[PDB]
Amino acid sequence: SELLVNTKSGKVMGTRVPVLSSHISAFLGIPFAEPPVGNMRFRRPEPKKPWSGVWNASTYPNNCQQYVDEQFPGFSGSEMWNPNREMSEDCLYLNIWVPSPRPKSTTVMVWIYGGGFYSGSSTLDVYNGKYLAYTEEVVLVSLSYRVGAFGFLALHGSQEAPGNVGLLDQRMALQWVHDNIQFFGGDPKTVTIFGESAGGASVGMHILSPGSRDLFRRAILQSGSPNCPWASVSVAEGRRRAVELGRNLNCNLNSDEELIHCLREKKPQELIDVEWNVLPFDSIFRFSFVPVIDGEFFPTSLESMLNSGNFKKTQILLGVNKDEGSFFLLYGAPGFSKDSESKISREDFMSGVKLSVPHANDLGLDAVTLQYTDWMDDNNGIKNRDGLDDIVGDHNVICPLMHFVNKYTKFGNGTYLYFFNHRASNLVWPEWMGVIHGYEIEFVFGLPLVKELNYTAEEEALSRRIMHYWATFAKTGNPNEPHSQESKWPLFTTKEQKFIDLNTEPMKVHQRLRVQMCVFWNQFLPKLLNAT
Amino acid sequence: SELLVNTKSGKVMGTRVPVLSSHISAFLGIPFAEPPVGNMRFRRPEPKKPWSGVWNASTYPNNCQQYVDEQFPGFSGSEMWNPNREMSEDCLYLNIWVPSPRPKSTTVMVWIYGGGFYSGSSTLDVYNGKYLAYTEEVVLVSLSYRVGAFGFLALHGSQEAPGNVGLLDQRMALQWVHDNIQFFGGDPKTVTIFGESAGGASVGMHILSPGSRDLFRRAILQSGSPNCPWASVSVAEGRRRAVELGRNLNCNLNSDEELIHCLREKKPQELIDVEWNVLPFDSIFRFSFVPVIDGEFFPTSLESMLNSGNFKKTQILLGVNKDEGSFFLLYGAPGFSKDSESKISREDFMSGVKLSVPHANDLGLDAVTLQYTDWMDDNNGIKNRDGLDDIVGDHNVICPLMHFVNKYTKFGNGTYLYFFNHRASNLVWPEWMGVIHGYEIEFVFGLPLVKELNYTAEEEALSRRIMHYWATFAKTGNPNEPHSQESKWPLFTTKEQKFIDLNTEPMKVHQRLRVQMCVFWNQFLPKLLNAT
Ligand SMILES: *[C@@H]1O[C@H](CO)[C@@H](O)[C@H](O)[C@H]1NC(C)=O
Ligand SMILES: *[C@@H]1O[C@H](CO)[C@@H](O)[C@H](O)[C@H]1NC(C)=O
Ligand SMILES: *[C@@H]1O[C@H](CO)[C@@H](O)[C@H](O)[C@H]1NC(C)=O
Ligand SMILES: *[C@@H]1O[C@H](CO)[C@@H](O)[C@H](O)[C@H]1NC(C)=O
Ligand SMILES: CC(=O)SCC[N+](C)(C)C
Ligand SMILES: CC(=O)SCC[N+](C)(C)C
Ligand SMILES: [Cl-]
Ligand SMILES: [Cl-]
Ligand SMILES: [Cl-]
Ligand SMILES: [Cl-]
Ligand SMILES: [Cl-]
Ligand SMILES: [Cl-]
Ligand SMILES: [Cl-]
Ligand SMILES: [Cl-]
Ligand SMILES: [Cl-]
Ligand SMILES: [Cl-]
Ligand SMILES: [Cl-]
Ligand SMILES: [Cl-]
Ligand SMILES: [Cl-]
Ligand SMILES: [Cl-]
């Protein structure tokens, strides 16, 4: 049976799924680790004990315990990202979409979901890999990993809650793929990992961590980089937040042992109810439990690893969206609302700047303000709004990514950079938000090819062009079709620094993405803050 | 006799001079102070003892002892500013151009020459007031004052060389005008003082100093402000330079008395030969002997006087030229030459920045560089050149002036601001230098009306329009002709901050002159340098 596969962990039975007037195989909910429940909470993941009989992989698995966005009840724009299955700590499973007939040794792509390390699900409609697997004929895998305190609580020095376990969950799934994907017709030697925001930062982290490098061939990072200011904390900061979390749950704080024991006796939702209370500052685009620079998963500081070339050298494809910051301003910055144009007063602009650069002294805040203020029209509510939007995106996603791309390219084997600036015609979010964080994903997964979703024909063409870039890159390490007719996406070099726009218009090439602002964030501001 | 005038100092005999197919009276070289020679060198000026008989005021007087520009021997562009008479310490005289027939009580305008306080002459061809006196029918006076060590050596606490004497020379001439101008048909109650660069800074200094306020009605400042970074030094810095000057002349430095005695025994040229050796830093647009904030001529700091409104409240008309810095970059910045386009390398740009902001630490220099660098095209030699040009002009003239105008306007009785950006068609200096420092003067004095000078007809029209703005302002405190047909030069207000362009095109109104860059120089950079 085409739907029956025998793996080293045991046999699994898939299900036939329809896709674009055709069909393919799907193996949903395959376990790759033992349930991290009970006393295994906060601990590293243990490999799934092989099973007897046949595992039913016909339906999606539970989602990991996580905070749920209720900011706009019933609104599809926000709820499309929420868990669409039952939540449980028993959530370590993976999904596989296999072309029909089953391949013998084709390209593999593993998706790592984003969500600021505090949320995320592999089962979202926007992550359904059947379209991509079918259209580009690749084996598409989507993994899962613990988020929130469950996956990143960090009490360095301890073995019950070392930190980064959520990252180890990812690695274990990659290990499972490396060991069993052949049985599904996948080529374990041509695996490409890709993800967005926290997932993109994750991809970069596996590129850096020695213990992950051998498990994949190349990588794609979307709107996320390992060096982002929100993607990691020091061991001391991680410890402070863990203790503070315990303080919120009236725990005994005399020892790690006692703290960990107390937290383990709490129900999942109890940890989630107070998770946001441990942030050090009033801020936006900052999440409580994220990876920790432990000296283990990460040997040394991210920057020193990047400077010395201490990382996997291969090919990478990465990029950003035009308005990465709008979402986080809506949810927390004063003056922004979902149903208004959100024109920002000068006062609110100032408040926003402070929320955006929490680690800044007055001089730093002044530098940022001056850098993003048009002094010939400083009371222009639209410029203030758009200016704040740029500040958040530049600081949190674009400039950190540009720093990563420039450092990696010095030792890498090929870089491809993109700038996604197409706002979908069927977007339910307001116009002022522009090309939102995470809204290139629907194009990467081919949702536009689905007529009932109501995208324009041009948007379907873009989706197909993007899916082919991604799949072709995953297969050859070059997004371009050898001996092709269409325009060529040029390599990004240290000298030329070329990139392309990804939109419904004919491809255009540019150079030095957001260079003026990124010199500010990556060189000047840091010097200023350090000197003061 | 129309050429014979009897003043409180004695009788003077003028000369009839031709001007634009007509004639007027001229009284050249009238003394207003005793010769500051011998033991009077460095001392405050003493009023000229009245004389018996008739003083021959038919020819120009000697020029004060000063450094002479020999950077381009035979070049008119530079030599037109050099002394055109014999130099002597006996140089305290004034010149008067009186309409014919002699008026009874008309508007008076007193010109104060510029030249960085280290040079200048009232007898330059470009300062001939016959055209302005004739065309606008005003009594035009041009004074003189000691420059260099002779007029500004400052050993605060001493009475032999207190400092600011060159400014006192100016005041004495203003006093003389206040007492005797009536005899020449001038109205001592409607005197307007005006000057360019150091002369413009001087005008502002008389507006501030209590001892000068009662001697004039209103003021005009061209490309200069009292608060310019080069226009003054502290008493301690003034003292350091005086001592260092003495050290250069192998003087006894045991006491002010001995230092002053030694300097007085030196020949004029001996002081001038080493004058530039006392500057504290390698720099451009910085002059050795300038006014000193002594607590006497200036009661308190310039900034505190401006904030509290401790200054003469009247009407003022002021402005700047488009490329104030080009001249000083040519003479000292590496990479600039008179006969080349002076395209600047990135290295030379960096060196220039350092020469331009001598009081800056590395962080400050980085701030300036970032502020004026186009990172999408940082090796563009023309942008680098023009960028440096802006840095020098913004820092040394424009932003300081904008700071002054905004502070004065809060307490003043009417402000008129202009931006002069017309490059003369017969300019002998290279094109890259643009609208040079001091090149609006020829238009203020009506040289374009002289056919043999070869200006375009449009340039003659501009000159006449500027001369009428200046003269009309001097007369009424408003440059605009009451019930006029031409466009109106609007008042500059704290809120609107309107100004006009002065060029051969039809008047245009703008707002917030160089606001973006001046917020940098006037608010941000100072904070940065103070915090670091
Ligand atoms: C699980 O597998 C069975 C076949 O053994 C199938 O009938 C069922 O639909 C699958 N999922 C469930 C329990 O609904
Ligand atoms: C990638 O590496 C191969 C050798 O392994 C080399 O020949 C090729 O030029 C490299 N390409 C890039 C873009 O560095
Ligand atoms: C000085 O005045 C006399 C008349 O007494 C005149 O002849 C002469 O030209 C004037 N200047 C000189 C000395 O040339
Ligand atoms: C100038 O002062 C007079 C009173 O002395 C006042 O009436 C007039 O409005 C003032 N004008 C300006 C521009 O301040
Ligand atoms: C980007 C986000 O979803 S903000 C997190 C929710 N919070 C504001 C209630 C803490
Ligand atoms: C602006 C200037 O004339 S520079 C002064 C002359 N120096 C360079 C020889 C000291
Ligand atoms: Cl077998
Ligand atoms: Cl086996
Ligand atoms: Cl479908
Ligand atoms: Cl708090
Ligand atoms: Cl960069
Ligand atoms: Cl949507
Ligand atoms: Cl909408
Ligand atoms: Cl008489
Ligand atoms: Cl008398
Ligand atoms: Cl003439
Ligand atoms: Cl030196
Ligand atoms: Cl200003
Ligand atoms: Cl000239
Ligand atoms: Cl020329």
- Where exactly are the structural domains of chain A? 1-532
Locus of tokens 């371009």: A480
Contact A374, A380 (CB under 8 A): yes
Burial class (CB in 10 A: 0-12, 13-18, 19+), A303: exposed
Give every CB contact of residue B79 below 8 A, 6+ residues apart in sequence.
Answer: B69, B72
Residue B378 is classified by DSSP as T
Beta bridge partners of A112: A195
Phi and psi at residue A333, to the nearest 5° = -70, 135
Give every CB contact of residue A185 below 8 A, 6+ residues apart in sequence.
Answer: A98, A99, A102, A103, A104, A105, A106, A139
Give the residue on B whose Cα is nearest the Cα of A497: B376
Locus of tokens 């269409």: A486
Question: Distance, CA B18 to ligand 16 centroid (Å)?
Answer: 6
Residue A64 is classified by DSSP as P
Cβ neighbours, 10 Å, residue A427: 15
Contact A126, A445 (CB under 8 A): yes
Inspect the interface and report whether the beta carbons of B376 and A512 lie closer than 8 Å.
yes
Contact B394, B518 (CB under 8 A): yes
Task: Report how far Cα A294 is from the mean position of its chain's Cα atoms.
Answer: 21
For A262-357, list the strands marked E by DSSP.
Answer: 316-321
Which of A61, A46, A55, A47 lies closest to A7, judged by CA?
Answer: A55
Torsion of CA B401, B442, B486, B193, to 10 degrees: 50
Is B3 close to ligand 3, i.e. is its CB under 6 Å away? no
And the tokens for B504? 């051969």
Tell me the one-letter amino acid at B82: N
Contact A196, A122 (CB under 8 A): no
Q: At what angle do helices A198-208 and A165-180 cross, to 10 degrees?
A: 70
Beta-sheet pairing, A4-7 with A10-13:
antiparallel
Is B82 close to ligand 3, i.e. is its CB under 6 Å away? no
- CA separation for the pair A303, A414 (Å, rounded): 20
Burial class (CB in 10 A: 0-12, 13-18, 19+), A523: middle
Distance from first CA to last CA of chain A, Å, rounded? 68
Which of A158, A17, A153, A142 lies closest to A89, judged by CA?
Answer: A153
Beta-sheet pairing, B93-98 with B139-142:
antiparallel
Inspect the interface and report whether the beta carbons of B375 and A512 lie closer than 8 Å.
yes
Exposed e or buried b for every residue in A163-190, given b needs 16+ CB within 10 A? bbbbbbbbbbbbbbbbbbbbebbbbbeb
And the tokens for B298? 């200036």
Cβ neighbours, 10 Å, residue B203: 30
- CA separation for the pair B136, B481 (Å, rounded): 13
B374 near A CB under 8 A: yes
And the tokens for A76? 């599809």
- CA separation for the pair B451, B441 (Å, rounded): 17
- Coil, strand or helix at A323: strand
Does domain B1-532 sit in CATH 3.40.190.10?
Answer: no
And the tokens for A188? 């374990």
Ligand 4 atom nearest residue B414's Cα: 13
Judged by phi (left if over 0) then psi (alpha if -120 to 50, else beta), residue A70 lies in alpha
Locus of tokens 């392309």: A500
Give A496 to chain B, closest Cα distance, Å: 11
And the tokens for B246? 């003495």
For residue B375, give the nearest of A366, A367, A519 by CB distance: A519
Beta-sheet pairing, A498-502 with A415-420:
parallel
And the tokens for B520? 């940098």
Contact A195, A112 (CB under 8 A): yes
- CA separation for the pair A128, A144 (Å, rounded): 14
Is A381 close to ligand 5, i.e. is its CB under 6 Å away? no
- CA separation for the pair B171, B161 (Å, rounded): 17
Within A86-208, residue ranges assigned H as helices are 130-136, 148-152, 165-180, 198-208
Beta bridge partners of A30: A94
For B269-342, list the strands marked E by DSSP.
Answer: 316-321
Cβ neighbours, 10 Å, residue A496: 12
- CA separation for the pair A272, A264 (Å, rounded): 13
Inspect the interface and report whether the beta carbons of B370 and A520 lie closer than 8 Å.
yes
B156 is annotated as an active-site residue:
no
- Coil, strand or helix at B50: coil
Sheet holding B10-13, edge to edge: B4-7, B10-13, B54-56
Give A531 to chain B, closest Cα distance, Å: 7
Give every CB contact of residue B112 below 8 A, 6+ residues apart in sequence.
Answer: B143, B145, B170, B193, B194, B195, B199, B202, B203
Give every CB contact of residue B400 below 8 A, 6+ residues apart in sequence.
Answer: B225, B227, B228, B229
Is A332 close to ligand 5, i.e. is its CB under 6 Å away? yes
Within A372-477, residue ranges assigned H as helices are 381-393, 399-409, 441-444, 457-476
Beta-sheet pairing, B218-222 with A316-321:
unpaired
- CA separation for the pair B205, A70 (Å, rounded): 65
For residue A363, give the nearest of B366, B519, B528 by CB distance: B528
- CA separation for the pair B328, B325 (Å, rounded): 6
A261 is annotated as an active-site residue:
no
Residues of A with CB below 8 A from B363's CB? 527-528, 531
- Coil, strand or helix at A438: coil
Distance from first CA to last CA of chain B, Å, rounded? 68
Give A520 to chain B, closest Cα distance, Å: 8
Contact B110, B174 (CB under 8 A): yes
Burial class (CB in 10 A: 0-12, 13-18, 19+), A113: buried
Question: Distance, CA A275 to ligand 5 centroid (Å)?
Answer: 10
- CA separation for the pair A290, A303 (Å, rounded): 17
A249 near B CB under 8 A: no
Stated as kind and residue range, the H or E segment containing B18 is: strand B15-18
Contact B449, B20 (CB under 8 A): yes
Give B262 to chain A, closest Cα distance, Å: 47
User: Max CA-CA distance within chain B?
Assistant: 73
Locus of tokens 């048909």: B185
Tell me the one-letter amino acid at A416: Y
Phi and psi at residue B323, to the nearest 5° = -125, 60
A527 near B CB under 8 A: yes
Inspect the interface and report whether the beta carbons of B532 and A532 lie closer than 8 Å.
yes
Q: What sign does the dihedral B375-B379-B383-B387 (CA atoms) show?
A: positive
Phi and psi at residue B155, to the nearest 5° = -120, 75
Sheet holding A15-18, edge to edge: A15-18, A23-31, A93-98, A139-142, A106-112, A186-196, A218-222, A316-321, A415-420, A498-502, A509-511
For residue B512, give the nearest of A376, A520, A532 by CB distance: A376
Locus of tokens 């060096």: A227
Contact B459, B443 (CB under 8 A): yes
- CA separation for the pair B59, A474 (Å, rounded): 90
Cβ neighbours, 10 Å, residue A346: 14
And the tokens for B466? 């500027």
Contact B29, B47 (CB under 8 A): no
Count the residues in chain A: 532
Cis peptide leading into residue A482 (ω within 30°): no
Catalytic site residue from B197, B209, B288, B463: B197
- CA separation for the pair B345, B384 (Å, rounded): 7
Cis peptide leading into residue A268 (ω within 30°): no
Ligand 2 atom nearest residue A415's Cα: 13
- CA separation for the pair B290, B312 (Å, rounded): 22
Which of A107, A103, A76 lies closest to A216, judged by CA?
Answer: A107
- Coil, strand or helix at A207: helix
B8 near A CB under 8 A: no
Residue B183 is classified by DSSP as G
Beta bridge partners of A111: A142, A194
A524 near B CB under 8 A: yes
- Coil, strand or helix at B427: coil
- CA separation for the pair A363, B291 (Å, rounded): 33
And the tokens for A162? 């070392």
Task: Report how far Cα B112 is from the mean position of its chain's Cα atoms.
Answer: 7
- CA separation for the pair A418, A441 (Å, rounded): 14
CA separation, residue A6 to residues A27, A47, A184, A356, A527 (Å):
12, 17, 9, 51, 57
Phi and psi at residue A394, to the nearest 5° = -60, -55
Resolution (A): 2.3
Ligand 2 atom nearest residue A315's Cα: 13
Exposed e or buried b for every residue in B64-79, given b needs 16+ CB within 10 A? bbbbbbeebeeeebbb
And the tokens for A522? 């990556």
Helix/strand number for chain A, H first, E second: 19, 14
Residues of B with CB below 8 A from A516's CB? 374-376
Inspect the interface and report whether the beta carbons of A524 and B374 lie closer than 8 Å.
no
Beta bridge partners of B106: B186
- CA separation for the pair B220, B132 (Å, rounded): 15
B510 near A CB under 8 A: no
Cβ neighbours, 10 Å, residue A446: 24
Stated as kind and residue range, the H or E segment containing A415 is: strand A415-420
A197 is annotated as an active-site residue:
yes
Which of A426, A438, A430 lies closest to A324, judged by CA?
Answer: A438
